Amino acid sequence: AYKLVLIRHGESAWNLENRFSGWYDADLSPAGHEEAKRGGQALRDAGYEFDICFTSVQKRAIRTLWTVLDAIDQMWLPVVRTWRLNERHYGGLTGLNKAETAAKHGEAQVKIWRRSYDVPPPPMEPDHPFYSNISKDRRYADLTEDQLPSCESLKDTIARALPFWNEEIVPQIKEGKRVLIAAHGNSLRGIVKHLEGLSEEAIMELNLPTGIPIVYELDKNLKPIKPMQFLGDEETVRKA
Amino acid sequence: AYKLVLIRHGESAWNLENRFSGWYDADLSPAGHEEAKRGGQALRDAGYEFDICFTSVQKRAIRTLWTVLDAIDQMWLPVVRTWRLNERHYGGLTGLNKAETAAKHGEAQVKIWRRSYDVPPPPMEPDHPFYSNISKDRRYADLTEDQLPSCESLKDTIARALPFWNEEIVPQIKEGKRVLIAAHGNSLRGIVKHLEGLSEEAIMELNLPTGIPIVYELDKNLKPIKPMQFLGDEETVRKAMEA
Numbered sequence: 350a351y352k353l354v355l356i357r358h359g360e361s362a363w364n365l366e367n368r369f370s371g372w373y374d375a376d377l378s379p380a381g382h383e384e385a386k387r388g389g390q391a392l393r394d395a396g397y398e399f400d401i402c403f404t405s406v407q408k409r410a411i412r413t414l415w416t417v418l419d420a421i422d423q424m425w426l427p428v429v430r431t432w433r434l435n436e437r438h439y440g441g442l443t444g445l446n447k448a449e450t451a452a453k454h455g456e457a458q459v460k461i462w463r464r465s466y467d468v469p470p471p472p473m474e475p476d477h478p479f480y481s482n483i484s485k486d487r488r489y490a491d492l493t494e495d496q497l498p499s500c501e502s503l504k505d506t507i508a509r510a511l512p513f514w515n516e517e518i519v520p521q522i523k524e525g526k527r528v529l530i531a532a533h534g535n536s537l538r539g540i541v542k543h544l545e546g547l548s549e550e551a552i553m554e555l556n557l558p559t560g561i562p563i564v565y566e567l568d569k570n571l572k573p574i575k576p577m578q579f580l581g582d583e584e585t586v587r588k589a
Numbered sequence: 590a591y592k593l594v595l596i597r598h599g600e601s602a603w604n605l606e607n608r609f610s611g612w613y614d615a616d617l618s619p620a621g622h623e624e625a626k627r628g629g630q631a632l633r634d635a636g637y638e639f640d641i642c643f644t645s646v647q648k649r650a651i652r653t654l655w656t657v658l659d660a661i662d663q664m665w666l667p668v669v670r671t672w673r674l675n676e677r678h679y680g681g682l683t684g685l686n687k688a689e690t691a692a693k694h695g696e697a698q699v700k701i702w703r704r705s706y707d708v709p710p711p712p713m714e715p716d717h718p719f720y721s722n723i724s725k726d727r728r729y730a731d732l733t734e735d736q737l738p739s740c741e742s743l744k745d746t747i748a749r750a751l752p753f754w755n756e757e758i759v760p761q762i763k764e765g766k767r768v769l770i771a772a773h774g775n776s777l778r779g780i781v782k783h784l785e786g787l788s789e790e791a792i793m794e795l796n797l798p799t800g801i802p803i804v805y806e807l808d809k810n811l812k813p814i815k816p817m818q819f820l821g822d823e824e825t826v827r828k829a830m831e832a
């Protein structure tokens with residue numbers, strides 16, 4: 350049986366500022382960093398070892414990867430970064446305050462483009478305070494006019510995530526390499542959905558714990574031979 | 590003109606313990622870490638930006654790479670790690686104390702297998718304290734019996750470094766990608782020698798500053814168009830060159 354491990358990053362600087370992050374490169378908050386440490390300790394204690402790692406091109410996710418490798422003393426591992434594992438692009442809501450946004454458009458509206466499977470938030474216009482900050486960033490200089498999103502629905506996110514998983518990650522798993530993916534909530538949801546074959550409703554209600562190692566054991570067809578497992582003290586694995 | 594940047598890692602835990610490190614995975618000391626931060630900011634202030642990075646598989650070098658990327662806000666850069674950029678393997682001297690070693694073998698002998706060009710140190714015997722910690726480390730699971738050294742002369746180090754530079758790095762440079770190499774003294778010496786076409790004696794007289802960005806400007810033949818340049822306060826540079 351193959352062993353895959355996922356880890357959603359913890360609290361970011363904009364998280365405790367209650368702002369929508371999306372593609373904005375917010376860095377981890379101290380608690381977010383600490384969270385990745387305790388999650389790292391967990392893998393170390395469990396004795397896990399990997400062969401290759403995948404992550405996005407966003408600080409909060411990458412730093413999480415670094416903190417873990419350090420903890421499990423595997424900084425030498427090959428690392429592959431890709432925009433396809435990025436958080437979902439919150440379009441024009443980027444930078445706004447989640448609270449003020451609900452008070453302005455009504456909770457119902459906000460709830461929608463936040464828990465919807467195909468409702469794209471409004472696009473990010475050229476005047477948005479973060480338009481050149483994200484749209485004009487070397488990071489994505491090799492992306493086609495399309496590929497660079499103006500906004501994304503979880504469906505959009507998944508559509509551009511899986512191609513990578515299928516073409517880049519699956520091959521490594523089939524080659525028997527222990528993979529470690531350090532990414533975001535929405536991009537990791539796409540993998541989980543594909544793995545467990547969940548419905549659209551199913552994933553909208555699924556909230557992956559942060560900074561906690563998510564373990565999957567796949568069969569010869571990359572199918573979870575069991576529900577996802579968490580690592581760490583019961584007082585914590587319980588909380589999940 | 591192409592722009593290449595090199596950076597030798599700073600003080601390690603065994604450095605302030607005055608022990609020979611070689612392939613032992615010693616981590617950076619706090620000063621070594623701070624030393625990288627400063628170098629990184631130097632790059633930040635200068636406005637440098639890269640496209641890809643190369644490093645070894647040793648903590649002290651990698652951590653240096655991380656500290657720099659963080660400082661120049663380029664953590665998203667593609668990173669490639671390789672044992673071919675590793676420090677020179679100090680064979681059986683690994684772990685020993687440089688001082689006690691000279692007192693037991695005489696400074697002349699020690700000076701030799703430290704500033705020599707083709708004289709390797711004593712092999713690391715299977716009864717060595719770090720023989721398994723190093724030889725049996727997963728990091729090298731894929732190396733062939735030959736590839737995995739028990740000791741290396743600076744010449745040995747270079748012999749296994751350049752193949753990578755030629756096959757892996759040069760192509761990226763020719764593709765116009767701004768490269769950043771974070772490695773060790775002996776492995777970086779191999780690149781410098783190849784670049785400036787230095788003699789064995791010349792290379793043996795070269796001590797690369799640590800934690801200081803080394804900038805090269807190459808022509809279409811990947812040949813320097815000016816001497817190497819250093820980045821940082823004039824004092825910072827001065828102080829570093831002396832060590």
Ligand SMILES: [Cl-]
Nearest residue numbers: 428667668669
């Ligand atoms: Cl990395």
